[PDB]
Structures are given as C-alpha cells and as structure tokens.
Amino acid sequence: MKYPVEGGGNQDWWPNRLNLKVLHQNPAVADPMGAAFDYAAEVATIDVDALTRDIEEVMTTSQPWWPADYGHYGPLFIRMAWHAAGTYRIHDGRGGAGGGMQRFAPLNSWPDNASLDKARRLLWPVKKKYGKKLSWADLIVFAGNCALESMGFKTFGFGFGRVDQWEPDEVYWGKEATWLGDERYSGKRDLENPLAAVQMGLIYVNPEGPNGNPDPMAAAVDIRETFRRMAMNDVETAALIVGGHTFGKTHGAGPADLVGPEPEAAPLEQMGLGWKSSYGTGTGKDAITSGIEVVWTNTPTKWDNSFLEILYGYEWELTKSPAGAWQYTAKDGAGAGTIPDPFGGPGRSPTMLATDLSLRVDPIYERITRRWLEHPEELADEFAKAWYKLIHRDMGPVARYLGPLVPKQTLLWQDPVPAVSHDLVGEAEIASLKSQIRASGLTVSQLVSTAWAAASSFRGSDKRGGANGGRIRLQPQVGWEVNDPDGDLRKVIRTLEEIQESFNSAAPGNIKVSFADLVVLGGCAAIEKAAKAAGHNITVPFTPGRTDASQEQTDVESFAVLEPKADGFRNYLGKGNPLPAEYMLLDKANLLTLSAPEMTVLVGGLRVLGANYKRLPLGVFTEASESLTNDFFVNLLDMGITWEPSPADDGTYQGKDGSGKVKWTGSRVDLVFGSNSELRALVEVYGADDAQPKFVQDFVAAWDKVMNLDRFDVR
Amino acid sequence: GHMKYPVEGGGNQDWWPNRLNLKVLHQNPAVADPMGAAFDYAAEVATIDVDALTRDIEEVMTTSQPWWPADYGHYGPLFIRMAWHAAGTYRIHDGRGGAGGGMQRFAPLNSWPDNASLDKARRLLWPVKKKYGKKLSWADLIVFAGNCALESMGFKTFGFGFGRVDQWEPDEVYWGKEATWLAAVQMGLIYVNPEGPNGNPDPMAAAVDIRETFRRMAMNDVETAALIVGGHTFGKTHGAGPADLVGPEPEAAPLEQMGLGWKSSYGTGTGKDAITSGIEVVWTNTPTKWDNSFLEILYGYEWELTKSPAGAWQYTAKDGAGAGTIPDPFGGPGRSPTMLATDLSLRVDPIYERITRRWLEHPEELADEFAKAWYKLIHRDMGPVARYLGPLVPKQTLLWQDPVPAVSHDLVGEAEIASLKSQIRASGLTVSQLVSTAWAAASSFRGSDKRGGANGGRIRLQPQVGWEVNDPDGDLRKVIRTLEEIQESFNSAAPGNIKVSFADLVVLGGCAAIEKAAKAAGHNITVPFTPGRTDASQEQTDVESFAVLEPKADGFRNYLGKGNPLPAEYMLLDKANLLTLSAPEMTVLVGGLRVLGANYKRLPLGVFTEASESLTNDFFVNLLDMGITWEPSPADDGTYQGKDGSGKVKWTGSRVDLVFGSNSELRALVEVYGADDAQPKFVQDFVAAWDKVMNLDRFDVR
Ligand code: HEM
Ligand code: HEM
C-alpha cells in the first residue's frame, strides 16, 4: 500500500534513492517568525532575575495533572535538561540541546523520554510570559540549571542563544526497527561508529546493565563507552552520574503493561501527552516512567554529599522492582525506613540502580568516587564543570554565548581563539595583500585547496572547526590525509607566514594581519585571478577579523573527530564509509549548511579550479588550466561522450568520445550530477549557453558563504 | 537492516507510518531554486523569439542521433507522444498532474512504464534548451516541441501560450496504492492498457476504460476520439524484441547511463531494434505527414488478433489485405496494416463509431476537433487566460477557460474604497456573514490547475451558490442581495466613470469585516485591497466543470462532508496545500476564522473565545490551557468536549480543531501566537494570510 502525500511518498518505490530534501531543512517558509527575527537581539535583553523567579515559582507549585514529588519539580527539570543534551555525539556533532529537538523529533517518544512531555508542558507558563524573547531550547536547559541553583548547588554559568527550529532534524539513530534494539554491536562492546547509544531509544545506557543483565562490571564498561562517545572522560562521567542522581527518584510503582502509547501514537484528546497510565490515579504516588522504584538519597531535593555515603555504606544485594525490573537494595535490611516518601507516609530502604554500583565496583570509578567520598568540594567542582560542558557542547564558539551569566574564563573544549589585539586591514591593505599573494608564486590550485581545507572542517551541527583560529598549521589538521601534508600545505603555509611577517613588519600604525585571515585572503585572491582568466572582473568579498590559535589552545584528541573520511568537494574518499560516495557528499553538504544549487556550483567550480585531492584529473572536465569557467557542467551534459566503468575496478569511470579515445575520467560524485534527475536539473541551469556570468557570481556567493560559516563574532 | 540513513530516505515515517506529514506545506522552497528570488519567468519568456525557436526545434527533429536513431528521419512523432504524456496526467478531481510544472522529468513520472523511451526524447531537446537557458523553461519546451512537431508535419494548430514555470523538486501526488508497477484502482499507466482492460484484447471492453479515463480529465466523446485519431496519425510503436532484455528504469539505472533508462540488450538496442512497449504497430502509410489515412485504414480492412515479436496482443488485417503497404522506419520491407487493441474501440463501439464514420468523409471536422482538443489538452492547468504569454496566444476565448469580462471602467481607489467600506459596515451584515461569504468566494481556488477563486464573481452563480458548504439554506442569498443593492447604489452615484463589480464588493466586504473585528479587538489596521475583479455571467460558467471544485471537506470552515479518503486532519493539510499556504499561514487562518465566526452552520465547534466577532488570539491561548480536560463526546459524533476544572463543559471541538494542540509540529506554531504580548503579531500575520488568500487568482495584476 502507499499513502497519498501527507502519509508518505516517493521514497517507497526506490527506498535507497538519493534524498536531496535534507539540503533544504528548516526552510524560511516554515519559520513562523519571519525573515527579520534576530534571536540574539531579543534574548540579549531579557531579565534573568524575573526569569529565575518565574522558574522557581513553577518548580515549587504542584499541578493536578502531574503531582510534584516532594513538592518540587526540580529533579524532573534536571533530568529533562540533560536528556536534551544527552543525545549529542562526537561522530558528527548532531544531537544535543542546541536545537531543542526534544519536542517533535523522533524522540519525544523515546522510551527514556517518558514523563518528559509533562516536564516540557509544565514550563508553558514561563514561555508564555516571554514569548519570542526566549526559545524552547534555551528554556529547557535553563530550567534544569535554575533547578540546580535553587537546590543548593552553585553552577558554573549559563549562556543563552540556542535558536529554535520548526522541523525535526533527521538524525540517524540506528538501524533497529523496534525500540530498544541492540543491532549496533560487533563481537565485544564495539558500538558502531555513527551511533553513541547502547540501544535504540536509550539516551545513554539501559538502567539494568547490558541488555537487562544486572552486572556492575559490564554496565560500567557500557557507561564508559557511551560517555566516551559524547566527549566525556572518566572523571566527568563519574561526576555527572553522582551529581545527577543526588536529586530525585525513579517511578516504577505499578506494572508497565498499564501504560498507554507514546505521544506520537496517542489519541488526540491527550493534547500531545503520552504514556497515560491506568494504574491507580496514573500520576503521583502511582507514576510509572521506567519501571524502577529507587530513591537514591534521603534528601532528594537538596544538594549534599549523601549519594556516595549511601553507596559506600551498604552491601547492595539484588532484588526486583515492583514493576518487574532489576535493582539493588541494602543487604540485611540496613537503614530501613530512612528514605522519605515522595508524597508522605512510610520510609524506604536504601536502593541503588544497577548502573550506580558500577561507580564503586569498576576500579577507575571506584578510585575517583572514593576520592570524592571524603572530599565533597572536588565533587562539586567536577560536577559544575561537567554540567557546564554538557549543556554548552553543541553551542559553538564562545562568541555565541549571550546573557549576563556567561563565565569569564575560557575552556579548552571550546576551541578558544585569542581576541583581536590590533587593528584590522581594510579596503587598501587588503588590495596590497592580494597583490602580494598573487605575486608570491603560489598557483591557483594551491591557494584554493588550502583555503578550502582550512574552511571545510566546519560542522553546522555543533559549530566546531572552521577557518577561524588558523588551525590548519597546527598538529591535528596539518597532518590529515585529505590535506596532503606531503606535496603541499607546507610550501603554502611557509610562504603565507613569510608574507604575513613582511606585511606586519611594515604596515602603517597598529594594523596587522593574522594567519587565518591571510589564508582566506589568498583563497579569495586566487578565485578572483581565475575569474579574470575566464574573462570576468569580479571581487570576492573578504571580512577580516580572524585570529590565530596556538598549539596549546588546540586539543589534538578533540579535533580527531573533525577529520573528514570523505570530502566529495575535493574528490577524496577514505576508508570505512557506511555509504557510497554521493551519499557522503550530501552528508558533507548538509554539515556545511549548503543548499543544492550551492553544492552544485561549489563542486563545479572546485573541479575546474584544480582543488582536487592529489591533483587528480577525476572530474576535471575542462581544457583551461585553472580558470573559473563554466566547463564542468557543459561537458557533463554532453552526449557525445559515452561513460563506462574503468576496466580496473576502482569506482572510477572513463568517458570515451565518438573516436573511441578516452577523453574524460570521473568518479561517483562527478557522474551523480549528470545522472540524478534532481541534480541534472540544476546542472542544466549553469550549463546553458548564457550562464557563465551567473555561474561565476553564484560560485563567488557560495564561496563567501563557506568561508564565513564560522564568523559568529561578526554575525 | 531497516531504519536507513536520513540521507537515503530515513526519517520519522519509518517509526510512525501514518502521521501528519507537514513537509507537503513547505514544498518547493525558495532555497532550492537556482534562479534566485528576483527571477521573473513571465518577464523572460515574453522576450523570446518564437521564429528562431521553431527554427532550432525543426533542425533538431530532422537530425538523427547515434544514441537514439530517428524513425523515418523525423523526431516529430516522438515529441508529440512526449508532449501528450506530459499533459496526460491531469486529474480533474484535484487538479494535480499536467504539464504545468514539467514533472515528467522528475522521479515519479520519468520512470513510469508508459514513459519509456521518453527520457531519450527529453534529451534530444537539450541543444534547444542550451541556447535559451532561463528564457525558456523545460515545462514550456516539452509541450512546445510537440506543438511544433504537429505544425512541421502539416497540421495547423490552434495556438500556443507560454508561461509554465519550472519547479526544482518533484511534486508529491497520490497516483494510487498498489506498491507494484501496473477499474477499481488506477495502475501505473497513463490512460489505459494498450492491450485492453487488464491485458484482455477485447476492444469493446477497452472502449469503456478509454471513456472513463478520458472523462476523468475533462474530455468528452468527441474530444476523446479526435485526440486518439490525430495522435496515432503519426509515428509507430516499438516492439522489435522480447521485453526481458530491457534494463532498469532511469531511477534504478546505473550511473554510466547518465539518467537514461530501459537500456535494451537486444541487437543494437536502438533504432531498428527499439523496444518501448512491445507491440510494434505502424498505424498509417505516411507516419510523418498529417492526412486522413488513419480512419481510411481502420475502416478499410477487417482485423484479427496476433502477437508482437515481444509478445503482446495486437490486431492485423485479415487474410493479408494489402501486405507491404506500410513503410518501416529504417529502409526495408513493407508491413501489413496493423492497429492497436484500443484503436478498434473507435470502430466497434456505438458512440465512437458514429463520430469516426462521420470524420471518414469530412476530414475538415476531424482537423478542427483535433486542433481544439490538442489546445485544450496542453493548456488545462495554465489557469486564467491572462497567464498566456508569447506571440502565439489565440485571440478568441473558450468556455473551459472560465473566461471573465475585461475591466471596462475606471477602478476605485483609496477614496471610494473608504466610502464603500463605510456602507458595507453600516448595511446590517454581521462580521461573520461578510467573512464567511468572502472566504467561500475565494476558497474554491486550488493552486494545482489554478482554477476558481474570487475573480469572476461566481459565488452568486448556479454551481457555487448551491454548494452545501456555502449556504446551509441561510444567509448567503441575503448577503448577495445586500451587496448587489450596495453595488447598484454606488454605481449610479459615481464621480466619473468609476464603477465597482460584485466580486470586488465581496472581497472588500470581507476586508471591511476584518477591519471591524480588529478594531473591536483593540488594533487599528487596514486590510490591503487590490481592485480589478469582474463579474462573469451564467453562460460563461460551465456548471458541470465546476462540480469538481466543490469542497468535500473544508477544515477552515470546520465542514466535513462525505466520501473523504482520510480523517479530518489530513484533508485540512490537503486543502492548505491546494491553497499554497505554509504551516504558519494555515495556523493563523484556522485560529482567526474560528473566532470570527466563519464556522459552517455557525457551530460552536472550535470557537474558544468568549466575545466573538473580535480578532483575538483567544483560540491559541485557550487551546494550550492545561486546565481543560478533553475527552470524546458521549455520542460518536467525532467531536470532543473539554470540561473545566469542575464537571462543566467549557469548550467543544473537532479533530481539525484539536490537532493543533496535539501535533507536536503544529503545537509549536500555536505556542508562538498563543504567548503573551503576541497579539499584534497574530493580527498582522492573519491580515497577511487573508490578503494572500484573497489575491490567489489575481494573475492580471502580477
Ligand atoms: C549527566 C548525567 C545524569 C544526570 C544529570 C541525571 C539526573 C537524573 C535525575 C535528577 C533523575 C531524577 C528524575 C526525577 O526524579 O524525576 C534521574 C532519573 C533517572 N536516571 Fe539519570 N542522571 C544522569 C545519568 C544517568 C545514567 C548514566 C543513567 C543510566 C541508566 C540514568 C538513568 C536514570 C533513570 C532510569 C532514571 C529514572 C527516571 C524515572 O524513573 O522517572 N541516568 N536522572
Ligand atoms: C487510449 C489512448 C492511447 C493509447 C492506449 C496509446 C498508446 C500508445 C502506445 C502503446 C504507443 C507505443 C509507444 C512506443 O511503443 O514507443 C503509442 C505511440 C504514440 N502515441 Fe499514443 N496512445 C493513446 C493516445 C494518444 C494520444 C491522445 C496521442 C496524442 C495526442 C498519442 C500520440 C502518440 C504518438 C505520436 C505515438 C508515436 C510514438 C513514436 O512514434 O515514437 N497517443 N501510443
């Protein structure tokens, strides 16, 4: 069967066809805020004291549709807050709280996101007051941060500026067709590269050990691997788990078969709420969220060093949750009736979750926690730093943090860049520098490839990398395989440093130029020289302001995830990619926040400009040496050429003319633009007889967009 | 192994396969357009040189290509088949299909079994498209190639009108639910199976399928017979070899083929060995010249079932009957006469037979009917005649175009509009009446074929005035009479030659009601108004052709008829897509029309405000209230009642009303206009959307 349009569509006949709809995600037509809504200018003016008062009033006020445990919705807001930021993953930077996707993405219905719909609904009275001055993404994490502040914990700081989105970001979470699927492992615990979760729908880890096996060692291994795949080491992981579970409790009062469907498969009358329980009242003393009934600490609404005292004070035999789940309880009934009830009444025995004994059984976590057992100040500092890192991972450079709560110091995981310490070049020194660069003896190909390598490391997901920082001469990026440290990127870098030294030593006044600015300027000078060679007199815009980071300010391991395993624009293909070359090219274009016409012009320009990996002729459908001409598209649509795969199986094709002599050679990413019906439509726009000026100006616009992707200090 | 990557089609539809897909509302965004935002195609094609354009197409047709050799040397019949396959997907019941957007070059259509060998046809035209570029769209070129092919082989066509704008992503259209390529349900074919119903070679049974499928695209018996007789006067059918040697369709073909599909491994694979459908029929002895030889052959011999070399039912002349009188595309022996299984329908069928026998002696009538039918075919979804461009548009108008009179007087502006608004408000008509009438006039528009709308003043004419959604035997006649009284009162006391038309008064009364409601709510605004509409008469309105425009479900008026295929939620998004509205525009329109009182039969279903006839955002603030517990009505009416904190029913709503508070994507938009200090934004957005809807069919001012 097939569904008309609003149920399904074209992906049914050909399930594995190239999907170009990912390149126009979040269109401005679907934005209800108009094309003049500058979120930064709005959120820069809110009153944080009033917002804190409103959030505290919401936390301390119980609501009939979701009775508050202990008369406080703080712990629920903390859980919501990190579950928003717990979907981040360093593989590609997707996920996290930077987009507020917890509302309508394919989560909002994940088994671990149970009872978080009520948490987001409880904050409507706050969002109602501030409207557009405060986004949902900002409010979700600020609610948890303010809950931590109100429950006695002094946090590091906070930064506003997470722009809302009005369309689910299509993120690959796994190949498992059913919830809690475990088809993402090979041999031992070897979680597949794209994913960062043990199962499907689980944020971090099943709270029963691997696949329901209540073994603290294996659970510890899973915790370590899962947190490692989200930029967290052992100390930060232990701090996060200890601090987070200091507050609140779990909800496993009744059997889980009485819980209704998820919000996305719920009746209309529920108003977008899901998991409606039929046990008892269904809320409050009879709430069911995960099936485990554990209260870790005897003061679950205050911050103190009581989680570790309880953890190391008992023996933790194994028992069963009243909903039928695995959990640990203090042996010999020690400390019975010492844990208070959420809604008044009898006490509880001390219970620990199956993954909470990992912190005292695994040797690494055991040493860390035993250190924190008698040194609560270290735990407080570590938790503050880890929480700050967790909330602001995918928010980008420090220039994007708004509001008055931003901390003053810099952290290495932010990829800090130094502030501008001189006066920027403008409109005359730029011309002189471009003249010097074009007279420096570097070819168009070298400059263009160096500029693209510097700038095409940006990810639109977590806004890491980019041309700012001048990090292409630093160790992680100067040695990448795609960058070819052998044949180039050393002559170019040395020449650019010589030019920078010569200019700075003689520039008037206190005007200097940074290395990154000079790299981008050389790229632009090469572009305009090639355009002049083609026959067009144009000027590539340049925005100075970049600064040079140092080696000590660059984390080599943190940058290892930005290395491209496949760069279709440079016609480079590494090893171990999950998909063919064209799909990887679309993924790269989506990461660069490009559209389809922009991708087309960038590919067609970089092909003829000589910015190919190893300067290979794969895709150079031109006879002009380094001229920004309209030749890639003209020769791609020519049917005087018959394409057929190379006799030596390489993933490369050769195009023979009418005389049978091989004229062109190409790859998957070169022929996909002439084969795909949606892409050939764009290629035919620039392949027309009168499209060379339009192609040149479009290429310059796309190039300037790519160079300025990471310029958040001027935008 | 399920749950593929989002880059290869993964997404939320894999988890919940029957959820509201809001991506149909942001379809074909401006960011995917390579031409930019300042591109005006109407100002580009108007400067084209048709004389130089026909000169290129002719030398393209008369120049064989090594990769697709030409049959008899001319590529004309192939272009005729392509042009009609482009326009042959039109559907009257929703307007989707046709050559309006040139979707034949995109994924759904370019890989249909009937569109075989048409990927080669669209590529032979690349040299023409290369010369002109943005001055000539693919959609315009595809049909102009067929028109110029008809002209080149001796047929004088009616005319041609440019103006089809290219779109850059395939249009999602429901072609049927079969999940297998190739009646109770419609298969993957264009009109009918060439071998008869379900492969049964009976021509009498194929006649009824032809009649039904052509009637479902606004063609009667005379136009159906003329189209088939004229189209099959040219060209031949390609069935030279078995069909198992044909490769995959273009969407499943490898990259070597550069977007071409159906690569044949039989013989050379092209030309003398071409395999497209597998029937191998040459209808006429002069397949590259227009003449009255199709009907002469059809009525000149007796026919007989045989099989094509590929294996397929076809008719050949009895006992020889002039073998070798039909030339083959590439020099060789002649062939005996041969007719398709659906071409005998025009002979053995009581209705078609009389028409074809009449044309057998009067070919001039056949030529005239074919010209008219072809012109109607390639211009079904152009819309109003004001959208035709180029120096080839015929002067005289046609009934199927929904003609309206030209403006024959001075237009009101900015001084009579103010006075007209002042007496519409003081005429006794309530805000609900005016708003409902204005919405009823302008909601008939559908953006697929650009039919209907406020222009023409057809809300008072026979088809629309009697629609169930329009007047539940109520105010519509009273509003129409009052507006006409105002019209004849204003026209007599006019300053000079300034006069106003009835449709203009309908839209202006809607705008005046909006202004009155906004002033009641506390905002002083002005709804933009662009005069220029005219009034059509009853004879210029075809009652039967307007019957398909009747809304079976209007989510904005909270009306649900009978015979809808999907629940009320999905039909609302379908109509919003037909009105070319985005999700915020749909949201503001739904939230504003409820409090204005535009509900069908003035029902309280979804009126979440206490003081009606006032343009507030009370719908959104009362939808997001969590003090209201929604639960289905005791009677299975499909309505829900939301009780207060006590056991008192505070509000009542329907599926369309409650889906905005339930769908997570739609609730995001509701929380924008439902927030505090968000009422001025809501008023401005509602006014912008209302003005956009009022001016949907105004192609005479663009
Ligand atoms: C940054 C790390 C973490 C933080 C900040 C955190 C915080 C919290 C808080 C405050 C609660 C109480 C919710 C409430 O009382 O409504 C909670 C519940 C819970 N946590 Fe975490 N936790 C973290 C890590 C983990 C990990 C690694 C697991 C592994 C299984 C886990 C599993 C659970 C479960 C199953 C619940 C029960 C929720 C319910 O039943 O309603 N958490 N968490
Ligand atoms: C019930 C109606 C029709 C049926 C079943 C039908 C079927 C067919 C089939 C099966 C072919 C063979 C194509 C191939 O094998 O390459 C064909 C060819 C053709 N058709 Fe139709 N057709 C119909 C109506 C029309 C109409 C309305 C037109 C034009 C207005 C038309 C114009 C043509 C032309 C010109 C060709 C020749 C193609 C060529 O020479 O390459 N046909 N038709």
Numbering used by the authors:
A (entry chain B): 26 to 740
B (entry chain A): 24 to 205, 221 to 740
The authors write:
The homodimeric structure is predominantly α-helical with each protomer (∼80 kDa) composed of two domains. A covalently linked “MYW catalytic triad” is formed by the conserved residues, Met255, Tyr229, and Trp107, which is essential for catalase activity (Jakopitsch et al., 2003, 2004; Santoni et al., 2004).
Here, we report the cryo-EM structures of WT KatG from M. tuberculosis with and without INH bound at 2.7 and 3.7 Å resolution, respectively, and have identified an ensemble of potential INH binding sites. After extensive optimization efforts we found that cryo-EM grids of WT KatG could be enhanced by the addition of 3-[(3-cholamidopropyl)dimethylammonio]-1-propanesulfonate (CHAPSO), which both reduced particle aggregation and eliminated preferred orientation bias. After optimization of the grid preparation method we collected a dataset yielding a cryo-EM structure of WT KatG to 3.7 Å resolution. However, on addition of the pro-drug INH to WT KatG samples, better quality grids resulting in higher-resolution cryo-EM maps were consistently obtained (2.7 Å, Figure 2E). During refinement of the KatGINH dimer no symmetry was imposed; however, despite this, it is apparent that the two protomers are nearly identical, with a root-mean-square deviation (RMSD) value of 0.4 Å for Cα atoms when superposing protomer A onto protomer B. However, there is one notable difference, with protomer B displaying density for residues 206–221. In particular, we observed three potential binding site clusters rather than a homogeneous well-defined binding site. While the density together with the bioinformatic analysis is indicative of INH binding sites we have not modeled discrete INH molecules.
